[PDB]
């Protein structure tokens, strides 16, 4: 009676609080069907009940709960429960539910009708005496409990059964914890950076008395960085409560606010007071503050608390069942004395979230804040290029606020305070977050942006052969090393696109970074152009130093020549061939490790003014052309660019192709635009006609760009190519392998 | 230890330190051991406060109330020798000096083999492997991959098949081996090797690698050799050693490889300094550092200095014409500097390389200093084949391959290029393998496994389509117009 009924809890992938999904060969398994109230029994003699739906992704003994159900249960995620499938009454007699006093403060009017009403409806969920629910809407998350049932101990929903429920907030037991505290679910993105702290402390901070059987060091310094403002103190607070562990919080002002003594006093009391009640995390954030550089510290106090943090982090080897965390901004930015082995060992960079993360924050926040229907937030996380977490906050906390501040306060004229049903009643608008969005947000970020790029083979027109090599160059050593093993071959750890200007070199880049689900670390010219100026080339190696800190990634040095093309060019400053920036590019290139799936590509349009030094063996060598598009091509890139706008049947891309030759990409996609242009001006001249009417259903502007527009915006095209260009070009290709 | 006493009050750290050495003293014979010595006494200028001197001078007169007593040794732990206050690398303070520096292969299977001496391996994990793919770790990271992997090789099972029971058991657990894989994955991401630092060692290349230039053998073994082995024969005839050779020749000939394998029959380090680094130290105009190389060499003594790319500054400095077109530059001037002023006898043996040997400052070759000249020559026929089949002797290869044809059709070209030719070579013969992986594997439902592991004679074949001379005819004869100013003709 053991083995069908073993399953570990897991993170959930679905909203609702009742349902638990199960992967597909379990279900057929345990003979259970959709609908099916199911009982489950945990820790502490604790029981609950559910609704089970299907899912996909996971394995024969994971299970999916939400963190309501999964408190609900008395277990934690990673724990053991066992579940039984049970008969349905699908019918109740009277319910009774009560609030929470501590999550019920200045609420007023009733509770029942605006939030227990639209709750229960259509939906059937099982329930169970003493459990605790939780309830969103009105901006706020309430908590409710059954404590009668009168049919059976659990009851199904069931509209014919109304809720007498008219009752004081009873007070919270205080063994058991809110469910408006922080968890795995509330924090948006970092999918990789939660995997790696999930698995760094499982086993100490779960399983203490494994790490007594066994001689076995796990590891203790964990050094959080990144951006300020992308909420580093949560995920601690978050895996304290995961695990259930004691979490202590130490920071760096309130330390540095007391006296000499006193301070000693609190870091040495912190240390032994999270080290009495094991196992215990000890979070000190604001690393930076209480430890920084050691030219930086000009005080002799300061040196002095430095050194007692570092006699407690060694008086900390001893000990299995103690973990620090620490949270910085850059980690070249504290005391080196701190980054070493024994200390903090283990560096996780959380970094900024991408397009799918900005969306799932805003999901986080906008949880409970009835948004209307029109409201895209796809729309908004494209257009929030640069906001970190606290951004994403402070943008719905604003536009809850503008969509509070211009109606339903001045109509609360006869009325004096706020109705929860009228509060209740707030939509926002598309044109709110437009709004919020638009002014008052600077965004806080200037830093590079290291991410899965979104465009795909499909976008690139034409250079079949090119993906055929590219995919061979990047993919197949990583894929499976083996057949390198047995023939004795070094991967290539490099390619220089060299070719005209503007044929998709970033493009190619990008496409195959985006199908090897690497990220991308961009490095462009005027960049390198600020390094050379500044004459600071040394953070050239921090550049390698967060390749290695996102691998895999594929870094692209674009512009590679544009040092050499602003130092004379072919003549000036005597006229050498290397520089600061390249020089240092080629000793962090060689002095890196030979496998890490780190693949540097670099990218010029001028081949011969690059010093020969770069494409020796061991370096970027692998030398590719990217050609001038024909016209099998050209009818490839102009469909591709013309694929996000509206175009009709009259259009000849055949002999717009045959038409236009010599032309780089780059100037057709201006051909397009420029097209697209005209096209708008055209509209808005439609609408200024239809809009000044006789007397100021025929709205359509005609939303089809015509030939005309093609055809007239065709007299503006222009060769941005040479033919000396073309031909100094096959001038470098014979110095290869093709004629010499 | 280090911190520890700047954690404690000015009269409480005095205090401690005094009471460590007294009581040390008491017990005799004793060790007193003070790690951390660049956290207790760093160097003059960096002593912001006032309470950091008086601990330092508090050190500096309990090292020198030292002298009486002989039954006490100090040994102290820092991390680069010119990062402590000069005032105690004196003599009777701290007058011996040991690197401990990095391990190498041997020395990393050797701490693998510590750490694992009790982890129940299996059979197919082979620590060479590891300690061949661990450059740049030193013992710590090591520790770290062993724990790692362990408790890697703990995580994805035998904890989740711990559900009908509770606890971990001690025969469950003796019954936890390790896999290839697992140390694939722990030392493929979440291990960033702590280094940056030169390396010195005895490298692995030997005089079977390189193809023909015996002569240059029978002249290596001499200038390295025959002195260090009995010097006997030089006092007899008064004749002071060589300390230095300068391999000019074509580009990618050989010259790092001959280097090496001299170094190698020699048993002795080798390190080296290459050409972005003369670069480094000319741009950042810091070229005092290039003294503490040579401190490195006698640290580790017996050397061979090899500081290739020796006309890379010369080169990024307009090369013939520019920035007034003179002969010396700083580095060099250093490196002359540092050169002649050096223990006459330590066994360091300082050894050039060059591609273009006219445009070198001519106060280099004088002697007492680096200054007899080898030409590196193009390799011929029978050299070529030896190139060919040492550089093939790493793959498989069969028998109709003709490398007598190979050698008459390719002359000209640099064993660099030859190189390259086998390694496209062998790269189109993987192309070809995973196009019949992808066909074997996309089967008619979906023994016959064998991909032919053997590079047949179409890849050469093909692949000598992409042969490239990188040398042309003017480099040779501006080679033997180098000749001709030496004793060959003039
Ligand atoms: N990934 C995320 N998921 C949810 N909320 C986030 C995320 N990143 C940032 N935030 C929000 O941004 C803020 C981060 O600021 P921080 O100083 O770290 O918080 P705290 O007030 O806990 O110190 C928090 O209010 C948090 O709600
Ligand atoms: N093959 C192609 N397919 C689609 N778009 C292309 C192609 N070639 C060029 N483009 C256009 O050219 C631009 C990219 O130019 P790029 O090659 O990055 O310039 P550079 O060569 O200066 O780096 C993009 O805006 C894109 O619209
Ligand atoms: N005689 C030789 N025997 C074996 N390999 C050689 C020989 N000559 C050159 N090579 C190849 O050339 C490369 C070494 O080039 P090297 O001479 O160091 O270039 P450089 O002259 O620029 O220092 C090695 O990869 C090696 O495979």
Redesign the pocket.
């Known amino acids: 009676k053991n083995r069908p009924n073993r399953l570990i809890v897991d993170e959930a992938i679905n909203e609702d609080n009742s349902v638990v999904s199960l992967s597909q060969p379990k279900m057929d398994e345990l003979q259970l069907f959709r609908g099916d109230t199911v009982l489950l029994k945990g820790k502490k003699r604790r029981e609950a009940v559910c609704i089970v739906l299907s899912d996909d992704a996971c394995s024969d003994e994971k299970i999916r709960m939400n963190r309501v159900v999964r408190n609900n249960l008395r277990v934690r995620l990673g724990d053991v429960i066992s579940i039984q499938p049970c008969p349905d009454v699908k019918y109740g007699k009277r319910i009774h539910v009560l609030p929470i006093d501590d999550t019920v403060e200045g609420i007023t009017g009733n509770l029942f009708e605006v939030y227990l009403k639209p709750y229960f409806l259509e939906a059937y969920r099982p329930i169970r005496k003493g459990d605790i629910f939780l309830v969103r809407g009105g901006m706020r998350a309430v908590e409710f409990k059954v404590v009668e049932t009168d049919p059976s101990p659990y009851c199904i929903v069931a509209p014919d059964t109304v809720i007498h429920c008219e009752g004081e907030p009873i007070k919270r037991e205080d063994e058991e914890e809110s469910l408006n505290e922080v968890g795995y679910d509330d924090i948006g993105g970092c999918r990789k950076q939660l995997a790696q702290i999930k698995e760094m402390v499982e086993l100490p901070l779960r399983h203490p008395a494994l790490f007594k059987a066994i001689g076995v060091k796990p590891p203790r310094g964990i050094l959080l960085y990144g951006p300020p403002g992308t909420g580093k103190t949560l995920i601690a607070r978050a895996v304290a409560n995961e695990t259930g562990a004691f979490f202590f919080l130490i920071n760096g002002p309130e330390i540095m606010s007391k006296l000499a003594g006193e301070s000693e006093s609190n870091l040495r009391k912190a240390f032994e007071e999270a080290e009495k009640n094991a196992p215990a995390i000890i979070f000190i954030d604001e690393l930076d503050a209480i430890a920084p550089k050691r030219e930086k510290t000009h005080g002799e106090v300061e040196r002095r608390i430095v050194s007692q943090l570092l006699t407690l982090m060694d008086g900390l080897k001893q000990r299995a069942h103690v973990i620090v965390m620490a949270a910085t901004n850059r980690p070249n930015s504290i005391d080196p004395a701190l980054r070493r082995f024994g200390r903090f060992d283990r560096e996780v960079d959380i970094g900024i979230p991408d397009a799918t993360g900005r969306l799932e924050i805003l999901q986080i926040h906008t949880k409970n804040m009835k948004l209307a229907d029109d409201v895209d937030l796809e729309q908004v996380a494209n257009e929030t290029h640069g906001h970190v977490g606290a951004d994403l906050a402070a943008l719905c906390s604003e536009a809850a606020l503008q969509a509070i501040r211009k109606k339903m306060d001045l109509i609360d004229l006869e009325d004096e305070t706020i109705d929860a049903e009228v509060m209740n009643s707030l939509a926002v608008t598309m044109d709110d977050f437009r709004w919020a969005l638009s002014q008052s947000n600077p965004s806080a970020l200037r830093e590079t942006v290291v991410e899965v790029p979104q465009v795909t083979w499909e ?5 079949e052969d090119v993906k055929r090599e590219l995919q061979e160059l990047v993919q197949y050593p990583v894929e499976h090393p083996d057949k390198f093993l047995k023939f004795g071959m070094t991967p290539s750890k490099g390619v220089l696109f060299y ?10 880049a990008k496409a195959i970074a985006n199908e090897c689900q690497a990220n991308f670390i961009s490095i462009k010219g005027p960049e390198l152009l600020t390094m050379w100026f500044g004459e600071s080339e040394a953070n050239v190696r921090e550049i390698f130093d967060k390749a290695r800190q996102a691998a895999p990634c594929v870094l692209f040095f ?2 590679l020549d544009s040092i050499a093309k602003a130092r004379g060019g072919n003549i000036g400053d005597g006229g050498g061939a290397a520089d600061r920036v390249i020089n240092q590019i080629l000793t962090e290139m060689d002095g890196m490790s030979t496998k890490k799936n780190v693949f540097i590509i670099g ?1 010029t ?1 001028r081949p011969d003014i690059i010093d020969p030094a770069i494409l020796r063996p061991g370096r970027l060598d692998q030398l590719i052309y ?1 050609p001038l ?1 024909d016209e099998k ?1 050209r009818v ?2 102009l469909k ?2 013309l694929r996000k706008s509206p175009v009709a049947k009259d259009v000849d891309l055949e002999f717009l192709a045959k038409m236009t030759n010599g032309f ?3 100037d ?2 201006e051909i397009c635009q420029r097209a697209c242009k005209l096209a708008i001006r055209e509209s808005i001249e439609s609408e200024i006609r239809r809009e000044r009417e006789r007397q100021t259903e025929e709205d359509d502007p005609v939303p089809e760009i015509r030939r005309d527009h093609f055809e007239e915006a065709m007299r503006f095209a222009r060769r941005s190519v040479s033919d000396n260009d073309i031909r100094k070009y096959e001038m470098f290709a014979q110095t290869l392998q093709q004629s010499r």
């Not at 070719?499 to 190619?508: A, D, H, M, R, V």
């Open positions: 976008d690139i027109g034409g250079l070719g005209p200007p503007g044929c998709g070199k970033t493009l190619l674009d512009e990218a349009n990217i598009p091509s490839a890139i591709a660019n780089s990409g780059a057709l996609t």
